[PDB]
Design an enzyme around this catalytic site. Structure first.
Site, short mmCIF file in Angstrom:
data_model
loop_
_atom_site.label_atom_id
_atom_site.label_comp_id
_atom_site.label_asym_id
_atom_site.label_seq_id
_atom_site.Cartn_x
_atom_site.Cartn_y
_atom_site.Cartn_z
CG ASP A 43 -1.12 1.33 1.72
OD1 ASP A 43 -2.43 1.46 0.41
OD2 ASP A 43 -1.40 1.61 1.98
CG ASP A 61 -1.39 7.14 0.90
OD1 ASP A 61 -0.27 8.22 1.31
OD2 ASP A 61 -1.95 7.71 0.40
CD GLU A 78 -3.18 8.36 4.88
OE1 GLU A 78 -3.88 7.61 3.76
OE2 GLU A 78 -2.45 8.14 5.65
NE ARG A 138 -10.69 13.38 3.20
CZ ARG A 138 -10.05 12.08 3.62
NH1 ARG A 138 -9.85 10.23 2.97
NH2 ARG A 138 -9.68 12.12 4.38
CB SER A 163 -1.13 4.34 -4.16
OG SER A 163 -1.54 5.56 -3.48
CG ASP A 173 -1.25 1.82 6.99
OD1 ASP A 173 -2.66 3.16 7.39
OD2 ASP A 173 -1.63 1.78 5.16
CG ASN A 190 -7.53 1.80 3.41
OD1 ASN A 190 -6.03 2.23 2.68
ND2 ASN A 190 -7.70 2.34 4.34
CL LIG Z 1 -4.55 3.60 -0.31
MG LIG Z 2 -2.90 3.79 4.13
#
Ligand SMILES: [Cl-]
Ligand SMILES: [Mg+2]
Ligand SMILES: [Cl-]
Ligand SMILES: [Cl-]
Ligand SMILES: [Mg+2]
Lengths: 203, 206
Positions: A9, A11, A18, A50, A93, A161, A164
Site C-alpha cells: 500500500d 500511504d 498520507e 477532498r 495507492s 496499514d 482499505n
Molecule cells: Cl489507499
Molecule cells: Mg494506507
C-alpha cells in the site's frame, strides 16, 4: 526460479504520511479535508470531495509536495530484498501518481497503480479519476495482476496499514499489517508494530 | 516473451460499446451528436466520454450487462488469440470503453488482461457516471508503458492492433503497429493494414 508477487500500500506503508493530507495543508485546507470522511466509509465520495478542496492548486506545488513525502526506514532495503528473491514488487495507492510515480522510480518498483489529479492550465482542477477509485479497488487489481503475471495467491505477499487493504488481504497468502489499524491487524498473517520496513525481511 | 495489445471497440468486436448502450436505452441521437464533434475536434475525448455516459443514467445494470455481453466478435477473434499464445504472446486488451464488456470478452477469449473504464452503479442501475484507467486519449500509451515496465518487455517485442486515432498513443510505443480496418489517421503511422473484417489475417504477421 519461482515467480512471486509483492504488493505494497502507499500511504502510511511506504511513506510515513498520507498524500491527500500533506497536499491539504500545503494548500491550507487541511482542517476541512481532515473532517471529510463520509459513511462503514464511502471511500469514493470521501476522496473526490477532498480532492475538490484542491481546485486551482498549481501543479508545480502539488508535484513538489507529492515527491517529498518522508519514507519509512528499510523501504529500499525491503524492496531490494524482495526483488533478489524473484518477487515482482508493485505498489497500490488510493492516492495519486504524482506521488507513486516518483517513489516507483526511486525504489525501483516494477509498477504502481493509483489515481490521477486532473490538471488544467498548469493547476489542479479539483477532479480525480484512475485505478483505485473504490474501496475494493485493490483486491480487484490484485486479481488482475495475478492473472496477468500468472502468479497464485500462494505466491503473493501483501503489506498495508488500513481498512482499505482488506480487499488486498483476501487474495494473499502472506498478509503483513504494518503499524496497522485494528481491523487489518486482526486478519494479518504478521503484524509489525515498529516503523521500520526492514523488520519484514525475516519473512 | 512477447506482448500483443488489442483495442476493443471496432478491433476485437465489430461494435462500439457506448452507442450499442445508447441506442438500447433510446438516447442514441444525443450520444451520436456527442460522439461526433469529439471525432471532429470540438471536444476532447475525456469530456465526450463523461457526457455520453450521463445519457445512460437509470439504465438497469442487468440489461446493461446483457447488451455488453451480446457484442459481435470479429471473425478470427479466437483464432488470433490462440495463434498469438503459441508464439509466446501475452494477450491484453485496452479500451476507452467499459469493463462491463471487456471483462466478459477477457474471460471468453481467456485474455491475460483487459484494461478499461468503469460505469458506476447505484441501486442496481447505471449511475450516469464513469471513472477509471483509460479516460484520456493518451491513456492507452501510458498504460502500455506501465505494462512494458511491469513485464519487462521491450517495445521491439510489442505488437499493437487498433482502428482509431485514440490508438496512436499505444502505436508510439510498438514495433509492430497494425491498423485493423482503421481510420486514415491511424493507417498513416501503421506498419501493416488489414482492410478485411477478418482478424485471422494477422496470423501471417505473428
Ligand atoms: Cl489507499
Ligand atoms: Mg494506507
Ligand atoms: Cl467506495
Ligand atoms: Cl478506446
Ligand atoms: Mg476503436
Amino acid at each position: 526460479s519461482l515467480q512471486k508477487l509483492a504488493v505494497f500500500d502507499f500511504d502510511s506503508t511506504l511513506v510515513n504520511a498520507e498524500t491527500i493530507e500533506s497536499l491539504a495543508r500545503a494548500w491550507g485546507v487541511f482542517d476541512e479535508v481532515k473532517t471529510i470522511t463520509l459513511k462503514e466509509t464511502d471511500f469514493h465520495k470521501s476522496l473526490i470531495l477532498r480532492v475538490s478542496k484542491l481546485k486551482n492548486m498549481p501543479l508545480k506545488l502539488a508535484k513538489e509536495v507529492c515527491e517529498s513525502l518522508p519514507l519509512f526506514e528499510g523501504a529500499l532495503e525491503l524492496v531490494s530484498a524482495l526483488k533478489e528473491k524473484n518477487y515482482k514488487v508493485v505498489c497500490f495507492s488510493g492516492g495519486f501518481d504524482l506521488a507513486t510515480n516518483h517513489y516507483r522510480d526511486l525504489l525501483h518498483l516494477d509498477a504502481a497503480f493509483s489515481n490521477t489529479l486532473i490538471v488544467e492550465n498548469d493547476a489542479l482542477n479539483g477532479l480525480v479519476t484512475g485505478h483505485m477509485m473504490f474501496s475494493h479497488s485493490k483486491g480487484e487489481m490484485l486479481l488482475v495482476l495475478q492473472r496477468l503475471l500468472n502468479i497464485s495467491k500462494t505466491n503473493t505477499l501483501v503489506v498495508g496499514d488500513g481498512a482499505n487493504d482488506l480487499s488486498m488481504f483476501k487474495h494473499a497468502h502472506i498478509k503483513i499489517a504494518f503499524n496497522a489499524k485494528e481491523v487489518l491487524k486482526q486478519h494479518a498473517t504478521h503484524c509489525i508494530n515498529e516503523p521500520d520496513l526492514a523488520l519484514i525481511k525475516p519473512l
